[PDB]
Structures are given as C-alpha cells and as structure tokens.
Design a protein around this ligand. Sequence first.
Ligand SMILES: [Ca+2]
Ligand SMILES: [Cl-]
Length: 123
Amino acid sequence: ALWQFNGMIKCKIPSSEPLLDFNNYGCYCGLGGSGTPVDDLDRCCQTHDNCYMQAMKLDSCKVLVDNPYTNNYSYSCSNNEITCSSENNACEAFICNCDRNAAICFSKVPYNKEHKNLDMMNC
Ligand SMILES: [Ca+2]
Ligand SMILES: [Cl-]
C-alpha cells in the first residue's frame, strides 16, 4: 500500500518526503500516466505503473480487491536496505517487489526539478 511504498522510498532516500517529492513528477510519477517518460526517474515510475498492471493480471490479486495502492504487505528497512517478507502471500509479495524495485530505481537516477508538476501537454 502507499504507506509501505512511502517508507521504502525513505529507506533508500532518507532526506525525502516521497509522497511530495515523487508525486506529480514527469508523465508517470503519480496516479496513472501517458506519453514518453521525460527522464530516467519518470521511466522508473513507468516501470512501476507497468508492474502494478502486471500484478493486477495475477489471479492471486484478482481474488481480493488487492488494489496495489491499498493492499498492505510486510517489508523491513534495515541499514537503508529493503527486504520483502516471506510471510507475504503471492499478490502482496508481487506488489512489494514492484515497490522495492521502484524505490531502488528512484535512488539511483537524477532528480530534475524542471520535471516536477510538468505540463501534461508534455505527455
Ligand atoms: Ca503513474
Ligand atoms: Cl534495498
């Protein structure tokens, strides 16, 4: 769920308020998306959106209203490393992996302030 994703991003980027810094960025960082990613961070967000789409294709998520932004899962942050838990069931585990991969991706790409609150005519 969004709560866990926020904490994962803070795990990798301890100075951030992720729900501010990484929402309404580019064409993809925020709910849904369109167009061509404007930079590698936006591409991280495109991949994450795609991962949530793939998740929802799984029968294990379809059985539970396991909507990735609201589906709680278990993970830890320790020494700024994210670990998804073996106690997660299949849908939860898939979402946790999507979120972990995106958090790591965000932490390894430039953050370009010119792409914050981008005009969608760019998308
Ligand atoms: Ca999105
Ligand atoms: Cl990690």
